[PDB]
Amino acid sequence: SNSSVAAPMAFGFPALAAPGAGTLGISVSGEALSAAIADIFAALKFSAWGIALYGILPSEIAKDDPNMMSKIVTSLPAETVTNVQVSTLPLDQATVSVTKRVTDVVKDTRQHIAVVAGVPMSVPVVNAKPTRTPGVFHASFPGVPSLTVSTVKGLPVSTTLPRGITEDKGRTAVPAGFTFGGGSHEAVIRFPKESGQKPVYVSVTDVLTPAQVKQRQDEEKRLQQEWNDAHP
């Protein structure tokens, strides 16, 4: 009974979106990344480090999503995550190098959305295709079979966090660990040249249940111990 497309969030602020017949629908406006978010990102300066941005409380998310169908979606202007001119990459290239990613991390037996950087990394790059509805483009990328993006430039944007997602305080970077991104799927989405729309980076994260978080936390601990023990 929700609409087919979510209202637009300011870039860097997450929305909860659920699929309608397998398709997630999101929207983006045309305001720049807020200085606040840009500053947390600038603080991230041979292993990846990350700064937690939002905490996830699955039991709180369940109050508005009892069947746990919603994903956490965060979007950024693509220039925020890469300096590559993506429109000029070869037609057959599936990925693009990035300087940072917004993806999930598990620490202290809790899931968070963090910005991570520090080592060479890429994400899939795909083309959004035009549809029969003005301003709505359709994309498909690894882990997200169907996503529509509505380019609603001019509309106001929201920074209000939905129940179950909280703002993490602090800008201190911590090692990213071993399983970062385990619950996320990201891509840089390119729009038709005729549209005039600049590419957008989208990160879609699964809301992990307490059982899933514990499993990942246990995996993180084990991989860390193995790494520790395998040093000279």
PDB file of all heavy atoms in Angstrom, residues 163-178:
ATOM      1  N   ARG A 163      12.159   5.337  11.476  1.00  0.00           N
ATOM      2  CA  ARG A 163      12.285   4.549  12.696  1.00  0.00           C
ATOM      3  C   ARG A 163      13.166   3.328  12.398  1.00  0.00           C
ATOM      4  O   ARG A 163      12.970   2.636  11.388  1.00  0.00           O
ATOM      5  CB  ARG A 163      10.930   4.062  13.180  1.00  0.00           C
ATOM      6  CG  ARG A 163      11.048   3.084  14.321  1.00  0.00           C
ATOM      7  CD  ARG A 163       9.778   2.983  15.183  1.00  0.00           C
ATOM      8  NE  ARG A 163       8.560   2.751  14.420  1.00  0.00           N
ATOM      9  CZ  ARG A 163       7.363   2.581  14.988  1.00  0.00           C
ATOM     10  NH1 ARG A 163       7.241   2.608  16.313  1.00  0.00           N
ATOM     11  NH2 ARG A 163       6.288   2.402  14.240  1.00  0.00           N
ATOM     12  N   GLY A 164      14.120   3.089  13.289  1.00  0.00           N
ATOM     13  CA  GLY A 164      15.008   1.955  13.141  1.00  0.00           C
ATOM     14  C   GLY A 164      16.366   2.291  12.585  1.00  0.00           C
ATOM     15  O   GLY A 164      17.242   1.419  12.511  1.00  0.00           O
ATOM     16  N   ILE A 165      16.545   3.531  12.135  1.00  0.00           N
ATOM     17  CA  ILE A 165      17.844   3.956  11.642  1.00  0.00           C
ATOM     18  C   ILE A 165      18.243   5.159  12.490  1.00  0.00           C
ATOM     19  O   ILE A 165      17.449   6.110  12.627  1.00  0.00           O
ATOM     20  CB  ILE A 165      17.761   4.381  10.163  1.00  0.00           C
ATOM     21  CG1 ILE A 165      17.237   3.199   9.338  1.00  0.00           C
ATOM     22  CG2 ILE A 165      19.105   4.868   9.698  1.00  0.00           C
ATOM     23  CD1 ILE A 165      17.259   3.392   7.850  1.00  0.00           C
ATOM     24  N   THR A 166      19.426   5.123  13.095  1.00  0.00           N
ATOM     25  CA  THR A 166      19.839   6.245  13.927  1.00  0.00           C
ATOM     26  C   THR A 166      21.154   6.852  13.459  1.00  0.00           C
ATOM     27  O   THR A 166      21.962   6.196  12.827  1.00  0.00           O
ATOM     28  CB  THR A 166      19.986   5.784  15.396  1.00  0.00           C
ATOM     29  OG1 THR A 166      20.909   4.690  15.444  1.00  0.00           O
ATOM     30  CG2 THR A 166      18.651   5.315  15.957  1.00  0.00           C
ATOM     31  N   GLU A 167      21.392   8.116  13.808  1.00  0.00           N
ATOM     32  CA  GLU A 167      22.641   8.787  13.428  1.00  0.00           C
ATOM     33  C   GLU A 167      23.757   8.384  14.377  1.00  0.00           C
ATOM     34  O   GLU A 167      23.610   8.509  15.594  1.00  0.00           O
ATOM     35  CB  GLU A 167      22.450  10.315  13.505  1.00  0.00           C
ATOM     36  CG  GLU A 167      23.663  11.099  13.091  1.00  0.00           C
ATOM     37  CD  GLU A 167      23.479  12.619  13.203  1.00  0.00           C
ATOM     38  OE1 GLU A 167      22.339  13.126  13.072  1.00  0.00           O
ATOM     39  OE2 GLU A 167      24.504  13.305  13.393  1.00  0.00           O
ATOM     40  N   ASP A 168      24.872   7.891  13.844  1.00  0.00           N
ATOM     41  CA  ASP A 168      25.984   7.529  14.702  1.00  0.00           C
ATOM     42  C   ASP A 168      26.750   8.817  14.973  1.00  0.00           C
ATOM     43  O   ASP A 168      27.035   9.562  14.052  1.00  0.00           O
ATOM     44  CB  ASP A 168      26.896   6.502  14.018  1.00  0.00           C
ATOM     45  CG  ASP A 168      26.265   5.110  13.930  1.00  0.00           C
ATOM     46  OD1 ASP A 168      25.598   4.668  14.896  1.00  0.00           O
ATOM     47  OD2 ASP A 168      26.463   4.430  12.903  1.00  0.00           O
ATOM     48  N   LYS A 169      27.070   9.099  16.226  1.00  0.00           N
ATOM     49  CA  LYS A 169      27.809  10.334  16.519  1.00  0.00           C
ATOM     50  C   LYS A 169      29.316  10.095  16.430  1.00  0.00           C
ATOM     51  O   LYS A 169      29.792   9.009  16.714  1.00  0.00           O
ATOM     52  CB  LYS A 169      27.431  10.853  17.911  1.00  0.00           C
ATOM     53  CG  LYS A 169      25.946  11.221  18.059  1.00  0.00           C
ATOM     54  CD  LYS A 169      25.551  11.484  19.517  1.00  0.00           C
ATOM     55  CE  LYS A 169      26.246  12.729  20.096  1.00  0.00           C
ATOM     56  NZ  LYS A 169      25.816  13.002  21.503  1.00  0.00           N
ATOM     57  N   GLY A 170      30.071  11.105  16.017  1.00  0.00           N
ATOM     58  CA  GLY A 170      31.513  10.920  15.913  1.00  0.00           C
ATOM     59  C   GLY A 170      32.036  10.739  14.494  1.00  0.00           C
ATOM     60  O   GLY A 170      31.322  10.275  13.605  1.00  0.00           O
ATOM     61  N   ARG A 171      33.291  11.126  14.279  1.00  0.00           N
ATOM     62  CA  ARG A 171      33.916  10.989  12.972  1.00  0.00           C
ATOM     63  C   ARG A 171      35.181  10.130  13.054  1.00  0.00           C
ATOM     64  O   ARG A 171      36.015  10.165  12.153  1.00  0.00           O
ATOM     65  CB  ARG A 171      34.290  12.367  12.404  1.00  0.00           C
ATOM     66  CG  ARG A 171      33.119  13.332  12.199  1.00  0.00           C
ATOM     67  CD  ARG A 171      33.575  14.540  11.391  1.00  0.00           C
ATOM     68  NE  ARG A 171      34.643  15.276  12.059  1.00  0.00           N
ATOM     69  CZ  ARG A 171      34.455  16.087  13.096  1.00  0.00           C
ATOM     70  NH1 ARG A 171      33.228  16.278  13.581  1.00  0.00           N
ATOM     71  NH2 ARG A 171      35.485  16.718  13.647  1.00  0.00           N
ATOM     72  N   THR A 172      35.341   9.356  14.119  1.00  0.00           N
ATOM     73  CA  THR A 172      36.554   8.558  14.214  1.00  0.00           C
ATOM     74  C   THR A 172      36.507   7.307  13.340  1.00  0.00           C
ATOM     75  O   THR A 172      35.560   6.524  13.382  1.00  0.00           O
ATOM     76  CB  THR A 172      36.841   8.151  15.651  1.00  0.00           C
ATOM     77  OG1 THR A 172      35.805   7.277  16.108  1.00  0.00           O
ATOM     78  CG2 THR A 172      36.901   9.386  16.548  1.00  0.00           C
ATOM     79  N   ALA A 173      37.549   7.141  12.544  1.00  0.00           N
ATOM     80  CA  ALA A 173      37.669   6.008  11.647  1.00  0.00           C
ATOM     81  C   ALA A 173      38.146   4.776  12.412  1.00  0.00           C
ATOM     82  O   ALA A 173      38.948   4.887  13.347  1.00  0.00           O
ATOM     83  CB  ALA A 173      38.634   6.346  10.527  1.00  0.00           C
ATOM     84  N   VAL A 174      37.643   3.608  12.017  1.00  0.00           N
ATOM     85  CA  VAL A 174      38.001   2.342  12.652  1.00  0.00           C
ATOM     86  C   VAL A 174      38.294   1.365  11.511  1.00  0.00           C
ATOM     87  O   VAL A 174      37.805   1.563  10.399  1.00  0.00           O
ATOM     88  CB  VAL A 174      36.821   1.825  13.509  1.00  0.00           C
ATOM     89  CG1 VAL A 174      35.574   1.748  12.670  1.00  0.00           C
ATOM     90  CG2 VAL A 174      37.135   0.470  14.096  1.00  0.00           C
ATOM     91  N   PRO A 175      39.132   0.332  11.745  1.00  0.00           N
ATOM     92  CA  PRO A 175      39.378  -0.588  10.625  1.00  0.00           C
ATOM     93  C   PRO A 175      38.055  -1.138  10.116  1.00  0.00           C
ATOM     94  O   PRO A 175      37.161  -1.459  10.909  1.00  0.00           O
ATOM     95  CB  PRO A 175      40.250  -1.676  11.252  1.00  0.00           C
ATOM     96  CG  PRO A 175      41.087  -0.874  12.225  1.00  0.00           C
ATOM     97  CD  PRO A 175      40.058   0.070  12.869  1.00  0.00           C
ATOM     98  N   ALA A 176      37.938  -1.275   8.795  1.00  0.00           N
ATOM     99  CA  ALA A 176      36.704  -1.764   8.182  1.00  0.00           C
ATOM    100  C   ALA A 176      36.443  -3.243   8.441  1.00  0.00           C
ATOM    101  O   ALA A 176      35.328  -3.692   8.296  1.00  0.00           O
ATOM    102  CB  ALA A 176      36.722  -1.512   6.654  1.00  0.00           C
ATOM    103  N   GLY A 177      37.486  -3.984   8.785  1.00  0.00           N
ATOM    104  CA  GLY A 177      37.285  -5.385   9.075  1.00  0.00           C
ATOM    105  C   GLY A 177      37.305  -6.273   7.860  1.00  0.00           C
ATOM    106  O   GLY A 177      37.770  -5.871   6.780  1.00  0.00           O
ATOM    107  N   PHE A 178      36.713  -7.457   8.018  1.00  0.00           N
ATOM    108  CA  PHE A 178      36.748  -8.470   6.981  1.00  0.00           C
ATOM    109  C   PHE A 178      35.452  -8.733   6.217  1.00  0.00           C
ATOM    110  O   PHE A 178      35.499  -9.216   5.075  1.00  0.00           O
ATOM    111  CB  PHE A 178      37.196  -9.786   7.631  1.00  0.00           C
ATOM    112  CG  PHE A 178      38.582  -9.732   8.194  1.00  0.00           C
ATOM    113  CD1 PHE A 178      38.815  -9.252   9.478  1.00  0.00           C
ATOM    114  CD2 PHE A 178      39.660 -10.106   7.408  1.00  0.00           C
ATOM    115  CE1 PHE A 178      40.105  -9.139   9.968  1.00  0.00           C
ATOM    116  CE2 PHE A 178      40.942  -9.998   7.887  1.00  0.00           C
ATOM    117  CZ  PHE A 178      41.176  -9.521   9.146  1.00  0.00           C
TER     118      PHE A 178
END
